[PDB]
Design an enzyme around this catalytic site. Sequence first.
Site, short mmCIF file in Angstrom:
data_model
loop_
_atom_site.label_atom_id
_atom_site.label_comp_id
_atom_site.label_asym_id
_atom_site.label_seq_id
_atom_site.Cartn_x
_atom_site.Cartn_y
_atom_site.Cartn_z
N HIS B 41 3.81 12.43 -3.16
CA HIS B 41 3.90 11.93 -2.01
C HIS B 41 4.96 10.97 -1.80
CE1 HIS B 41 2.51 8.12 -3.16
NE2 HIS B 41 1.33 8.42 -3.21
N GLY B 142 3.80 -0.22 -3.61
CA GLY B 142 4.84 -0.33 -4.39
C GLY B 142 4.24 0.09 -6.06
N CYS B 144 2.21 2.84 -6.73
CA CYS B 144 1.94 4.04 -6.86
C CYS B 144 2.76 4.65 -8.05
CB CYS B 144 2.20 4.95 -5.69
SG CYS B 144 0.71 4.95 -4.58
#
Lengths: 299, 299, 299, 299
Positions: B41, B142, B144
């Site tokens: 993503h 921040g 991920c």
Amino acid sequence: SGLRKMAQPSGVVEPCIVRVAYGNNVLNGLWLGDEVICPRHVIASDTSRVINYENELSSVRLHNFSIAKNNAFLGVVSAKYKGVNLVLKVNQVNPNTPEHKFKSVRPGESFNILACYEGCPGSVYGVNMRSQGTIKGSFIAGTCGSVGYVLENGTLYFVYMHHLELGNGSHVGSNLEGEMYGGYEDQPSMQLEGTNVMSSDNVVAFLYAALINGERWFVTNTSMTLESYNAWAKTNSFTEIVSTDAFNMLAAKTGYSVEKLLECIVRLNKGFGGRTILSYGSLCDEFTPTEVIRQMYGV
Amino acid sequence: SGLRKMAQPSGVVEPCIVRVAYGNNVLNGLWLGDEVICPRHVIASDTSRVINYENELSSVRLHNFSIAKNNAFLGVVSAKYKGVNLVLKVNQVNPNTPEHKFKSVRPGESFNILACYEGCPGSVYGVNMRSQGTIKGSFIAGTCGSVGYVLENGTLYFVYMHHLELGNGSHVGSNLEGEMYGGYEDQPSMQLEGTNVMSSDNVVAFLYAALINGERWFVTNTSMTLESYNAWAKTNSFTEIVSTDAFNMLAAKTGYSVEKLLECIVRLNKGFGGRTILSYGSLCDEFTPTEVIRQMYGV
Amino acid sequence: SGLRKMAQPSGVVEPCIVRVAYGNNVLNGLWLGDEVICPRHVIASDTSRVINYENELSSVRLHNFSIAKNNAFLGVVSAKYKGVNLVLKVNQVNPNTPEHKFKSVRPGESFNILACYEGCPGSVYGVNMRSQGTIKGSFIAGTCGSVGYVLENGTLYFVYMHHLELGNGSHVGSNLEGEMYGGYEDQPSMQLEGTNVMSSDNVVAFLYAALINGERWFVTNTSMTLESYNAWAKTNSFTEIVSTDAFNMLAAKTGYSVEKLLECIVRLNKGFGGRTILSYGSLCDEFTPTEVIRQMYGV
Amino acid sequence: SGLRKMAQPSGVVEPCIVRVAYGNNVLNGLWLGDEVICPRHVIASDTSRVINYENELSSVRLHNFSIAKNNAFLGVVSAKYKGVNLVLKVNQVNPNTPEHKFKSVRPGESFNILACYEGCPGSVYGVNMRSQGTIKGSFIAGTCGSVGYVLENGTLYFVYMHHLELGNGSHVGSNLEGEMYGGYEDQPSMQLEGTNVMSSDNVVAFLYAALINGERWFVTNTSMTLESYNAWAKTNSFTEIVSTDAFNMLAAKTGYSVEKLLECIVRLNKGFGGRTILSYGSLCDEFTPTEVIRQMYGV
């Protein structure tokens, strides 16, 4: 979201951990430049009985030391006591010596433990220095010489080296300059911990973390002045708070003033009434304002 | 304290963390050899609404990636999906690629999170995989791509990469094969976690830790057969215990048989009756037998 | 306004500098009365290897010395060590010998370096003695024997003579009595520095200077008591402050009490959050209250 | 008007003083909460020869302690050293324990002595710490463990416990963390004070006090630059003066600049030639400027 006791990454510290052997003792040392620091009781023949550190030091032969990183052996060329630490000179400079400083930690201050077993780093976890100079650090046999460190302002600080467990289970170590926290001595004798004072700044930080993470049942329409709180604190075993300045960020982001949380502390110190805050059933002073901000909003 | 959650040293993982940015998205990547793995993503143009990953990959521009490991920028040669992760071929081999393996963790198993914040490792802490494929960590914007690992035999296993947070606050990620734990999709859509099944092995370990810690109020000499317990567990959202042998150490040691503790679990599941166990108000399944054994004894 | 690290004027010191050579070695000496003082390693055949200073002295031949100055004609009559300095009796009195004394500088105290290159005064700049007995200057090959001085109460003091740079790049010298600051050895061997304690007095002066020059972002009107501040300092490698008296003029002129600045220091030591203070990125202790006062108010 | 050396009121301290007898020794203890703090030499077999404190404590008989307040006898239950202080755990908590902190006083600072005589508070008077960490008090056999304190911010600070007299008649004690001021040791060995350096700040205040009382025979129309004086000071065992302090309060209200007084100090240091200043026949450095200001004007 979420609140967890975290440790800062241990990578920069791991290559400084060595295995120090003398006689039938084996523990951990910190290898920086051409010297290794470790607890001085590694030379004691019987750590369960009273130790005469003067006599032990006279008995020392340098060739009886065994120091190893992985299994490359380092030869000791010199040994001295500095306070309750041994400082051992070796011929080899640690080629992975990080840029670092030594400092101590104050009551309420958080730091990282790299728990080591016989020269091998095994785990890492955050702890918090208490007012009597002890930590709750989950140490066991074989973990002496384990190292406490802080990363602050892009500086690596070494602040702790593990020595012993009190009768009540609390843990006692020294700074890297050989001064024992709490003034405890490195003897198997009976030593009493004493009156533990709650870090008020940390508890305020905890309640802010609670607010950010969804929990709000404890706040009312009451706030008390900093002076009035410090008056209360001085007789309920809580630290005084110097300045609200530390929490500005937290007050801004949550919309809750420090003075409201101060009133919360006075109330909540009397019980949670069955309820929990972030799963805790009582106030927790193990999180600093800095730790909470880091964790909630990024370094 | 008594029983505290620990992590294993993060040094071997830290050099693999990179900052990966594309469009308005910034998260963490895992740099191994000449490839970078990160949540796909990162190339989603809008992470607030449903995402067509086919289209997103179709319109990817390889020069629009920014990948950086502190000092070093990496150029992207190709992009592809593996499950819910992007696998990015990059122009440079990671010189610090460690010896590593991959596996998936199972419900009840503990592992370590290296929480990273836009490319920078910030903290390390332990978690435990729940039956519905979630963990309870502390992840914010921040983080991920943050990496989960275990140090085992005695090598490094990568087991988790962070993707998202459910509406109920539970945390969701994938294994390094791109299979989301629990089957959740990497979409900003409502997703229900479902009922949590407690790890019976871990709860038995929990109660041994409590006994070791001197807490005895919940035990009787009354016991419950392994078969009897499993019959109960099956309809009470607890796992069934295969065998008792993993506790032999703790059993022989505390002098409390597993069967006695099974009795305690069925009774304590009805509530703690206003008492605590290791400061908890209900049964805890986040500590494995291994963790309790190790954290109490000789490695 | 403005703040610049400055040097007291060097004119009185310049006529005292001479070239001292011996064999292939060339450095600087201080010529006063009928004596030239210089680093003793000028008579060492090979400064890149460890030196036996007793052997070197035993086999000095006085005619191998070369002393040069544009307006003088000098021969060596005699030589002996005083500590790590070579003291040469010469056959001519420096006609330009100023009234002078020798003294040692203490941690936190500032002085001037006249950097000389093979007998030739080349530059002059301010420095500050740190607690480990090092300075951060700028010395290269050819600059040994560069001289440090203070003009203090109308008196000229010589306080330093340059000898070497540590592995970490810090700079080491002796007083004019031949005592090396911080007790380092004039050997090309590996020597560690350890941790410098920040001068709290200097840091306070620096924040006052910041205020006077319009930096305001860091200041709040909360204050911290001297007592509280010193407890913090003791553990954070800052010196304790004895009296605020040395700041009264600065506190009067700015309207800011020392106590308000003490609070700033505790905050700012954690980091500037990315901001600057007079172009610095972290707290600075190279400026003394004296330096700040005469620079801001000319007194 | 008028200038007398004053003590702050002793009422808050008096209830904390107890008689401590062990074997042949009788002195004073400070009873705070459940602890009695006293000089550790109370348990020394023979205070007239070198003392082995490790052994004395090793062989200590807790039932040979006679601790009495009121006529209530406290029972000892635990003894340890804290530096040169014996810390005894007792069987009853002092109900009259005041709120208090610990701090160290520094050379030049004024504080209060509650002189106690074998258990009974007997007098209270002001002292000032000398350069070598001593005070000139009035202590005799039976007054050991007498306590020094400061009241500041309405806060009570314990700062001094009395141990011994030097050969020259100067008095030596520790802070309440057991660090002996001036680094002396609690041994009946010879110990030299070092030369006493008068506080120039305090002498100025003293002279200012004199002016205010209408005594001005000693002040002339001439002055001395701050830099002239400080030069004189180093030579003549006086401390250097930093800035002018806000002697301005005094300077303005008297008319005489500091510079005039500095000239007086130099002239008067020789002797007063038959005359006196506020009854003294020599310069007195026992009054701080803050002290004098309050004494005369109130602040």
